[PDB]
Ligand binder design. Structure first.
Ligand SMILES: [Cl-]
Ligand code: NA
Lengths: 71, 68, 67, 66, 67, 69
C-alpha cells in the first residue's frame, strides 16, 4: 500500500540525493538512501545504518526532487 | 470506518492547496501544503517536498476552516 | 471497535466538551466533530484531525451515558 | 489475550483500584469499568477512555489472583 | 516468535530477576510470572502488567541459556 | 526497493560477530554483538546480555562496513 512512499524513496535512491531523516526522538540522520523494504531504510555513509521506519518522522531531500510515480 | 473521514479530509486540503501545519509526536511543527498522500505517508511541500510517516503525526491543523 | 465507537458517537451527538491527551502529554480541547477507524476530527477554532495512534486518553467534561 | 483478558477482567469484576501509567509517564487512577481490544474505560468523576497503545503498565492497588 | 518466546519462558521457569526498560526510560524490576503475545506480568516488590509495545529492552540479571 | 533487507543484514552481523550500536527511540545507545534475532526482537550481548524489541529501535549502526546483501 505504499503507492506514494515507494516511488518517492526509489527516486531518492536512484538519484543518490543526500537526505536528512528525522527520527521520532528528534535525532537527525544524514546520508544517501541505498535500499529499503517494507520495514527499514538502509542509509549510507561511513557504514550503512539500518533505520526502522517505525522510528522515522520525516524524510527531507537536500534539494527538490521530481516525483515520477511508478517506482 | 477509516479512512472514510481521513481521506476526503486530506484530499480537500490537497486540492484546495490549503496552508496547513502538521504536528509530530515529538512536538515538532511542520508547515506547508499537502502535495499528496497514501495509506502510510503524507508528502508535505515547502522548499522541498518532505515525506512524513503518519505513525509520527499527532495532528493536522488547517490554517483556515475547510469545508467537506 | 466494541467500546470506542459508541463512546465517541455519544460525545459527538451530544456535543460534549472533551479533552484529548496525546501520547506526548499535550492536551487538546474541544468537541468531537466526527471520527473514523483511525482519526478523530476535533472542533474548536478549526477542525483538526488527530491520529488515534497519538492519543493516550479522551476525558469528557461531565459524565456521559452508559456505556 | 490469554493473560491480558483474564487479568483486566479480574480487576474489573473485583473493582480493584488500579494505577495505569502511560508511555509519557503520567499516572492515571481509577477502576476498570470495561475494556476491549483497543481501549480501557477507567472510572472516577467521569469515565475516561484510555488507548492501550499509550499504556506502559497497569498496577493494581492490591494483590489480585486470576 | 522463535526467540522471544523461549527467552521469556526461560526467565519465567527459572525465576530470573529482570530489569525491563520502557520506551520512556523508566526501569521496572521483578520476575516474570507469565506473559502472552502482548503483555508481561511482572511480580515482586511491585506486581504489574506491562504492555510489550512500551518495552525497549529486557535485561536479565544473569544470562539465559536457551533450549 | 528491497525484498527483506533486515534478515540478511542482521544475519551478516550475527554470523560475522560484528560489533554494533543499537540506538533506541528514546535516544539511548546499546552496544554489543547480535547473538540472535527473530521477527520482533534482537538478542544483544557483551557487557550486558539483553533482548531488545524492534519496535523500540531507531537505527542499527555497525562498527565496520557489512557485506552487500
Ligand atoms: Cl462518564
Ligand atoms: Na541472556
Amino acid at each position: 500500500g505504499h503507492s506514494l512512499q515507494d516511488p518517492y524513496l526509489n527516486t531518492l535512491r536512484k538519484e543518490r540525493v543526500p537526505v536528512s531523516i528525522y527520527l521520532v526522538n528528534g535525532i537527525k540522520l544524514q546520508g544517501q538512501i541505498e535500499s529499503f523494504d517494507q520495514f527499514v531504510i538502509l542509509l549510507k555513509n561511513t557504514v550503512s545504518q539500518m533505520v526502522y521506519k517505525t522510528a522515522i518522522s520525516t524524510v527531507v531531500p537536500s534539494r527538490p526532487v521530481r516525483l515520477p510515480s511508478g517506482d
